Each structure stands twice: as C-alpha cells, then as structure tokens.
C-alpha cells in the first residue's frame, strides 16, 4: 500500500482539491481527481471516492481529508475577505 | 423406479396436505400440491396405458 | 465434535443479554432455566459460555414484572451454542422474554 497526496489550488473564485490515491494489496491505478470550480461538493466527492475504493485505509483517507478540509477552510476565509 | 414416484408423491401429498389444512391460506404451495397431483396423474395414466393387472395393483396398494 | 448428533434434529445458538447488576443467580439461575431447556431438548447442550459485560449502544425499557424502571448502558452477554429439536423453540422464546434477568433475546440457526 503506497501513500498519498492531496493537491489544492487557491485562486480567488475557485478551489480545486485534487486527490491522488494509491494501491492496496490489489494493483490499481488512480488518477488525481480534481474537483472543480462550480459549487459542487469537493469533500463529499473526494471522501466518497475514497470510501468507494476501500483500497484506502482509514488513516490514509483521513489524513488527505484533513488536508482537504484545511484548504477549503482557508479558501472560505480568503473568499469572504480579500486576502489577495 | 415408478412406484417409488407414485408412492413418494403420495407421501408428499399426505405431509403437504396435513400441512395445508391446518394452515389454510398459503397460496404458494397450492401450486405444489396441484403440480404433484397432475404429475402423479400423468404417471398413473402412463402405467395404466402400459398394463392392466399391474396398475390394478397400484390402485390396490393405496 | 458437533456434527455427531445432527442426524435427527437441528442446531441453534441463542444470544441473550442480561442485567449488569447481579453477579449471583446469573450464571446460576439462568443455567437452571437452561436445565429447563435440558428437560425440553436433551441434546449436545455444550458451550453455553459467557461474554464480558460491555457498554452497548442504546437501551431502554426493562419491563420488570410491574417495575418498568431501569434504563441501561451495560449488560452481560450470554450466548448458548445449544442444539435441539425444531419443535419447542417458541417456548424457549417465551422463557427468554418473560424472565426478568433476560432482555432482548435473539436466537439464531448457524449452518
């Protein structure tokens, strides 16, 4: 079981959260799924994809979700203000 | 083995009937009782078609 | 060792949870009603073993005989890996509903 990377991007309007996932005991190829500019859910889409995998351990899913959460959180604050 | 089919279906109808008459509303096993009656009945017309005396013995056994 | 007797009759396993308070007449009296089952069943009645008391999820509604008092969070987890005729299981259900120290008794039929 390889281990993992969320990649975020912040531009003022729009978050992207990108989940790159990895192999269980069964050889698999994930992408990085990038979740998108419209208000359509990023955390639900990401976490659900991970749960749908089961190929991801709980520690792995959670660490990536915590990082994802943190960025959505920073993003909400910057959007409500102007940080940039 | 034919008389084991007729006799086996007869014990099938005995145990299923004493199931069904003290129960009275299972409309699924009614088909099972009627498929068994028809299946046995085509066997009895079969063995009656073959023989006389031997089918008379099948009547006299039950 | 268990497939010796099931030419003839059936196999079950009853899960029953208990009160958390009493430690006496709990292994005793419920084994005495297990002997009432022995008058009923009379087969390889073994492995009636006990499981430790732990906090369950949510339970209300003891229904004592005219008590109707105690909420709960804990319970002793008995399970009887017993073995009997398929006749007279409903009286085991009534015996494991009506008695006080047995609440929420679900029997099963392992294969």
């Amino acid at each position: 079981k390889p281990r993992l990377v969320l990649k975020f991007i912040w531009m003022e309007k729009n978050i992207g959260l990108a989940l790159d996932q990895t192999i269980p005991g069964h050889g698999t190829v994930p992408l990085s799924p990038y979740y998108f500019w419209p208000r359509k859910d990023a955390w639900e889409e990401l976490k659900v994809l991970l749960e749908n995998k089961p190929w991801i351990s709980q520690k792995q899913m959670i660490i990536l979700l915590n990082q994802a959460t943190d960025i959505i959180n920073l993003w909400q604050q910057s959007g409500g203000n102007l940080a940039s | 083995s034919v008389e084991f089919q007729v006799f086996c279906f007869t014990n099938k109808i005995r145990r299923l009937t004493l199931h069904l008459e003290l129960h009275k509303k299972d409309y699924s096993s009614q088909r099972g009782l009627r498929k068994t009656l028809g299946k046995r009945q085509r066997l009895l017309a079969y063995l009656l078609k073959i023989n006389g005396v031997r089918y008379k013995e099948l009547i006299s056994k039950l | 060792p268990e497939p010796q007797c099931p030419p003839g009759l059936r196999q079950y396993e009853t899960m029953a949870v208990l009160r958390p308070d009493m430690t006496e007449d709990e292994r005793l009296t419920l084994t005495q009603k297990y002997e009432e089952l022995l008058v009923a069943g009379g087969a390889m009645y073994v492995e009636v073993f006990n499981r430790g008391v732990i906090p369950l999820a949510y339970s209300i509604k003891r229904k004592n005989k005219a008590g109707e008092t105690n909420n709960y969070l804990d319970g002793i987890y008995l399970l009887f890996t017993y073995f009997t005729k398929p006749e007279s299981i409903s009286p085991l259900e009534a015996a494991l509903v009506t008695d006080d120290d047995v609440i929420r008794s679900s029997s099963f039929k392992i294969r």
Binding site: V48, E51, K53 | - | L56, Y58, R104
Partner: protein, 64 residues
C-alpha cells in the same frame, strides 16, 4: 479484501465496523469492494448486531 476464512457473524466485530461508517450506516458493495454474497451476509449480520445494540442506529454529529 479481508475474508479471513472464518465466516462473518455478529460476534466478529473486527471486520464488522470496518464496513459501517462512524455515522453507523452500511456501505455499499462498490465502496466496500466485496462480492454480492459477502455484502448480503454482512448486511444480515450487521442488522443482527444492530438488534443487539452492539452498533448504534445513529451517531451524534460532532465537530472540532
């Protein structure tokens, strides 16, 4: 994976609770990645353990 030879019963609370969420609800076959048979058998077993109050019917929501 995780079939582990021994059959799934309500007494086996190890592989069970890998299948429910922390919110306490049953996950589907395409998430848990089992066969249909494993899915139905843990379904009946999980609902049995739901009767014995081994598992909550609802977990209270939490933050922070």
């Amino acid at each position: 994976p995780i079939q582990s030879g021994d059959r799934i019963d309500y007494r086996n609370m190890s592989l069970i609770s890998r299948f429910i969420s922390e919110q306490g609800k049953i996950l589907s076959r395409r998430v848990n990645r089992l066969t249909l048979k494993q899915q139905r058998l843990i379904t009946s077993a999980i609902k049995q353990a739901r009767i014995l109050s081994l598992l909550p019917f609802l977990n209270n929501e939490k933050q922070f």
